[PDB]
Amino acid sequence: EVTQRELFEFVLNDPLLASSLYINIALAGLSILLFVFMTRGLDDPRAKLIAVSTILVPVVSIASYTGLASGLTISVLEMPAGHFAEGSSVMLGGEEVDGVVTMWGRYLTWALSTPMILLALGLLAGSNATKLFTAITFDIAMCVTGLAAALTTSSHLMRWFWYAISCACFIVVLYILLVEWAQDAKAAGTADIFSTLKLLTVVMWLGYPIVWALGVEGVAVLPVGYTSWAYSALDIVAKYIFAFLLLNYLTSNEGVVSGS
Amino acid sequence: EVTQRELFEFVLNDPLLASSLYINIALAGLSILLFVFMTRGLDDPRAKLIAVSTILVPVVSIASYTGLASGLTISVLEMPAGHFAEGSSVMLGGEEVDGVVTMWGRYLTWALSTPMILLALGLLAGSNATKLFTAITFDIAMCVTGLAAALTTSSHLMRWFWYAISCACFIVVLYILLVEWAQDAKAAGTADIFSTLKLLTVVMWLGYPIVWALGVEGVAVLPVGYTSWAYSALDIVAKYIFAFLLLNYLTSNEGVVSGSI
Amino acid sequence: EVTQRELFEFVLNDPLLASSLYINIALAGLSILLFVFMTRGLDDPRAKLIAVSTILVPVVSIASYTGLASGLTISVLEMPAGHFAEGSSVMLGGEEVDGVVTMWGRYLTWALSTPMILLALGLLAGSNATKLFTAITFDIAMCVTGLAAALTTSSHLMRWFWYAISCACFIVVLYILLVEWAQDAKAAGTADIFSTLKLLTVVMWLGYPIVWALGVEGVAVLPVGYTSWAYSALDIVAKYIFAFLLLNYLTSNEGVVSGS
Numbered sequence: 105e106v107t108q109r110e111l112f113e114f115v116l117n118d119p120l121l122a123s124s125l126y127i128n129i130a131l132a133g134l135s136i137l138l139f140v141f142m143t144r145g146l147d148d149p150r151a152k153l154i155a156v157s158t159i160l161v162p163v164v165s166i167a168s169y170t171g172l173a174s175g176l177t178i179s180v181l182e183m184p185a186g187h188f189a190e191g192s193s194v195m196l197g198g199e200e201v202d203g204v205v206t207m208w209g210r211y212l213t214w215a216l217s218t219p220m221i222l223l224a225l226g227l228l229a230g231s232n233a234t235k236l237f238t239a240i241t242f243d244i245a246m247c248v249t250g251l252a253a254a255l256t257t258s259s260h261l262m263r264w265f266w267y268a269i270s271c272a273c274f275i276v277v278l279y280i281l282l283v284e285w286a287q288d289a290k291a292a293g294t295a296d297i298f299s300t301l302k303l304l305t306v307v308m309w310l311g312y313p314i315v316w317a318l319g320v321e322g323v324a325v326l327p328v329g330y331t332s333w334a335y336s337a338l339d340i341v342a343k344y345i346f347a348f349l350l351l352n353y354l355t356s357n358e359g360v361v362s363g364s
Numbered sequence: 365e366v367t368q369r370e371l372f373e374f375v376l377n378d379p380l381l382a383s384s385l386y387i388n389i390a391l392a393g394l395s396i397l398l399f400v401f402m403t404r405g406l407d408d409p410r411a412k413l414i415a416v417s418t419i420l421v422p423v424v425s426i427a428s429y430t431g432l433a434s435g436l437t438i439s440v441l442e443m444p445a446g447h448f449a450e451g452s453s454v455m456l457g458g459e460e461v462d463g464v465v466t467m468w469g470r471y472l473t474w475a476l477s478t479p480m481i482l483l484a485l486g487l488l489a490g491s492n493a494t495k496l497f498t499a500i501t502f503d504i505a506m507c508v509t510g511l512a513a514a515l516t517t518s519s520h521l522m523r524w525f526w527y528a529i530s531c532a533c534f535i536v537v538l539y540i541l542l543v544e545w546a547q548d549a550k551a552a553g554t555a556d557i558f559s560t561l562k563l564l565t566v567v568m569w570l571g572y573p574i575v576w577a578l579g580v581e582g583v584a585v586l587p588v589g590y591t592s593w594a595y596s597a598l599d600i601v602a603k604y605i606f607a608f609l610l611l612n613y614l615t616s617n618e619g620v621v622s623g624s625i
Numbered sequence: 626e627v628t629q630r631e632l633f634e635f636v637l638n639d640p641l642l643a644s645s646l647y648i649n650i651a652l653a654g655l656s657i658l659l660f661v662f663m664t665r666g667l668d669d670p671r672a673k674l675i676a677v678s679t680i681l682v683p684v685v686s687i688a689s690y691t692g693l694a695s696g697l698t699i700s701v702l703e704m705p706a707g708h709f710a711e712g713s714s715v716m717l718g719g720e721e722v723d724g725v726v727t728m729w730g731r732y733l734t735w736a737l738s739t740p741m742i743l744l745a746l747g748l749l750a751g752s753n754a755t756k757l758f759t760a761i762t763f764d765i766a767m768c769v770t771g772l773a774a775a776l777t778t779s780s781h782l783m784r785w786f787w788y789a790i791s792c793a794c795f796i797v798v799l800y801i802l803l804v805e806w807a808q809d810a811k812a813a814g815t816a817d818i819f820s821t822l823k824l825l826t827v828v829m830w831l832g833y834p835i836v837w838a839l840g841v842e843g844v845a846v847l848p849v850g851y852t853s854w855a856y857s858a859l860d861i862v863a864k865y866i867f868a869f870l871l872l873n874y875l876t877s878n879e880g881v882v883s884g885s
């Protein structure tokens with residue numbers, strides 16, 4: 105029975121792990137302060153909705169990363185027969201424990217933050233309610249089935265079946281970003297900025313399922329420490345710089361996005 | 365003590381249980397493909413909202429049933445003194461384990477899918493936001509208190525108290541379906557189709573608390589495998605057939621439901 | 626180790642704890658009946674939306690208190706080194722068990738009920754969607770980070786860090802309540818009733834983080850039983866009397882909240 109304290113201490117004493125986590129807690133906090141400063145001039149309710157949705161991204165990130173750092177949202181799971189990480193062991197407390205240190209808490213970071221990123225993008229693109237609803241519901245389904253895949257230890261094949269379902273949901277979100285909102289942004293007069301944020305988002309988001317496949321959750325070419333840093337690097341771009349670019353535009357183009 | 369693998373293997377090797385779960389994974393998948401194909405011609409935003417809300421039903425179902433088949437959302441619980449399934453055994457891994465294989469994952473299938481069924485129906489009936497909000501919130505309360513009932517092992521009476529709270533929430537949903545939306549559909553011009561789907565929905569949904577009461581969660585006249593098939597059969601009609609019928613109407617009457625979201 | 630039945634019995638057989646839980650189950654139930662009766666004459670859809678949102682408060686409360694009374698949402702946690710409740714015992718069943726009985730179920734009562742309180746108040750004040758969204762999202766964040774604080778056992782300081790994050794989110798909600806909705810209510814013609822409900826909400830809500838700090842979750846000057854009654858008393862006011870007052874006004878001013 106691994107304790108929360110043992111996982112908290114495990115993160116510590118492990119350079120790659122501890123740094124990938126605490127650096128994001130710090131960047132998330134600094135991002136929030138910066139973004140609040142940047143948007144104090146906004147008055148339009150719609151511009152402010154986009155701003156708050158955007159600021160909620162680093163808010164969810166600081167809370168969720170603290171969930172990981174504290175050990176609260178970390179568990180030790182034993183992979184099923186055939187899985188590349190099956191047979192692995194980790195030193196926890198004063199004994200060797202079978203399994204993999206599983207940072208399932210990252211899925212909470214994703215399920216709560218990705219909907220805010222999508223809401224901000226859709227509002228920016230002048231999306232109607234149907235498309236926002238579709239993008240957000242399928243995005244949440246993608247995140248939850250991804251968590252289910254990571255939490256499945258009964259069967260190797262089942263883990264990848266979950267992965268396939270999640271990818272299917274991801275395709276829906278990608279279609280809306282690349283095809284529908286890309287067109288809607290033209291009518292909203294935000295075609296240029298949306299194009300930039302869209303490219304950034306699509307490229308970075310595609311990185312997550314790749315890291316999943318290569319990291320300990322997948323074929324394990326990337327160890328627990330590198331897997332964590334891979335995800336943390338993606339978050340810095342998909343969340344913090346994405347948010348800065350969006351807000352930097354918003355604070356200089358409040359008139360453009362003002363509306364009902 | 366009991367592992368996910370042991371539960372996964374228990375489901376496999378158990379013909380009734382295995383089939384009740386995997387057949388729905390298959391039917392939900394085929395439903396998604398069929399529904400996406402059927403609705404490819406839709407252009408109106410409101411019509412498309414009704415379409416996506418309906419399609420989300422089998423999407424939630426396939427994911428949720430995978431949760432059950434994989435063993436992820438199944439647990440072994442020991443019923444409280446006096447419960448008709450108290451003292452049951454299950455044989456897992458290789459030994460006899462006290463308790464009942466509890467497929468609590470079904471409550472997730474319900475909590476995430478029923479709001480979508482209701483959203484689709486409310487929109488079809490031309491419901492205002494107040495009634496949709498009321499129907500959906502009490503519907504979620506119904507499924508969550510139902511899950512709590514199944515997860516309660518401390519007291520037999522408590523299990524049924526949760527069941528009673530859930531039933532009361534169910535009454536709110538039934539009232540909205542039978543009284544409010546029944547009338548709203550006439551103004552929306554969808555009276556014939558809504559009344560039909562309203563009736564099909566009410567009849568099938570009534571089956572769930574009956575199965576709960578008769579199954580292993582209740583008086584246990586229905587063993588685990590039979591309780592599972594009862595729910596899976598209800599799901600096939602309340603979800604897949606229901607959705608197929610709604611989409612059939614939708615794709616031939618886009619203009620009728622078109623308008624401001 | 627500790628079973629649900631053992632926690633269920635711990636609550637029973639303890640006059641203080643049992644009364645603090647079962648009384649609210651009774652009051653919540655009676656409140657639902659009373660409120661439904663009180664609002665049976667409403668016809669306006671906007672007024673009805675405010676009424677349902679309000680009625681959901683005691684609905685969530687009766688379900689959540691049943692979660693606690695049944696033992697379903699209670700756990701036994703061992704506090705970290707430095708915590709004032711470290712090395713505590715309880716006697717679960719008939720044995721001496723290390724740790725403190727943690728009624729984390731209360732956070733569920735809060736995360737699901739507070740958004741409904743805020744939705745009702747925001748609508749009464751004639752708030753736009755942006756402010757409602759901001760108040761509700763940060764309110765949920767406050768509740769979830771508070772839950773995380775209570776569930777954290779890896780570090781004593783980590784618990785207070787979660788507490789700090791939660792307080793920051795609370796300030797956002799307080800700002801909207803005290804500054805923004807105070808103004809909106811004037812234009813909506815509900816300034817007088819809002820002032821009353823606003824005052825009651827702010828004063829009562831401020832009490833929760835105080836009880837947290839003083840109870841077993843914090844410095845532990847208040848035993849498990851007194852911590853429970855403190856929250857239960859706050860709930861009676863922040864929920865039931867608050868709801869009654871709002872509904873009493875609502876039914877007497879249906880036309881004003883309707884708009885036209």
Ligand SMILES: CCCCCCCCCO[C@@H]1O[C@H](CO)[C@@H](O)[C@H](O)[C@H]1O
Pocket residue numbers: 235238269272273276279280284396400403404416419423426
């Ligand atoms: C395993 C779960 C995966 C299910 C994937 C099916 C989702 C179908 C969503 O509908 C489609 O959404 C597009 C973007 O909004 C519309 O352009 C298109 O017309 C509509 O048909």
Ligand SMILES: CCCCCCCCCO[C@@H]1O[C@H](CO)[C@@H](O)[C@H](O)[C@H]1O
Pocket residue numbers: 259261262265372373376386389390
């Ligand atoms: C429609 C959803 C698709 C998921 C299909 C999952 C079924 C895979 C079952 O695998 C088998 O399980 C046995 C018992 O655990 C092992 O002994 C055996 O070695 C393994 O190969």
Ligand SMILES: CCCCCCCCCO[C@@H]1O[C@H](CO)[C@@H](O)[C@H](O)[C@H]1O
Pocket residue numbers: 445446447520521524528
């Ligand atoms: C609306 C549906 C009706 C549900 C009725 C539920 C009745 C079940 C009561 O349980 C029994 O209560 C006794 C006293 O508390 C216990 O001594 C006994 O062990 C326990 O099994």
Ligand SMILES: CCCCCCCCCO[C@@H]1O[C@H](CO)[C@@H](O)[C@H](O)[C@H]1O
Pocket residue numbers: 445446447448577582583
């Ligand atoms: C809608 C379904 C109705 C549910 C009815 C549940 C009744 C359960 C009856 O069980 C019995 O209760 C006795 C106490 O009264 C116990 O002493 C006895 O051991 C127990 O077996």
Ligand SMILES: CCCCCCCCCO[C@@H]1O[C@H](CO)[C@@H](O)[C@H](O)[C@H]1O
Pocket residue numbers: 518519521522525630633634650
């Ligand atoms: C408002 C609804 C609240 C439900 C309250 C349920 C109380 C039922 C208490 O039953 C008793 O519990 C003891 C401890 O487990 C058993 O030893 C005893 O045999 C059993 O009869």
Ligand SMILES: CCCCCCCCCO[C@@H]1O[C@H](CO)[C@@H](O)[C@H](O)[C@H]1O
Pocket residue numbers: 136140143144156159163756759790793794797800801805
């Ligand atoms: C630990 C997380 C705490 C971070 C809190 C910062 C969130 C910033 C929310 O934006 C602010 O909301 C106010 C009320 O709506 C507006 O009056 C103000 O103009 C706007 O800038």
Ligand SMILES: *C/C=C(C)/C=C/C=C(C)/C=C/C1=C(C)CCCC1(C)C
Pocket residue numbers: 213214217218221246247249250251253266267268270271274309310312313316339342343
């Ligand atoms: C702040 C975090 C962000 C933007 C996270 C994005 C995550 C994804 C796009 C994840 C996608 C996945 C799949 C498509 C397949 C299964 C595994 C996942 C969950 C990694």
Ligand SMILES: *C/C=C(C)/C=C/C=C(C)/C=C/C1=C(C)CCCC1(C)C
Pocket residue numbers: 473474477478506507509510511513526527528530531534569570572573576599602603
């Ligand atoms: C796809 C699943 C559907 C349509 C499920 C519907 C479920 C219900 C109507 C459940 C109702 C219940 C009660 C009213 C009492 C307590 C037990 C439940 C949860 C089975």
Ligand SMILES: *C/C=C(C)/C=C/C=C(C)/C=C/C1=C(C)CCCC1(C)C
Pocket residue numbers: 734735738739767768770771772774787788789791792795830831833834837860863864
């Ligand atoms: C019905 C319940 C109500 C109105 C609950 C309100 C709760 C709060 C305002 C809680 C606030 C907290 C903090 C600000 C800090 C950390 C701990 C909490 C969760 C108790």
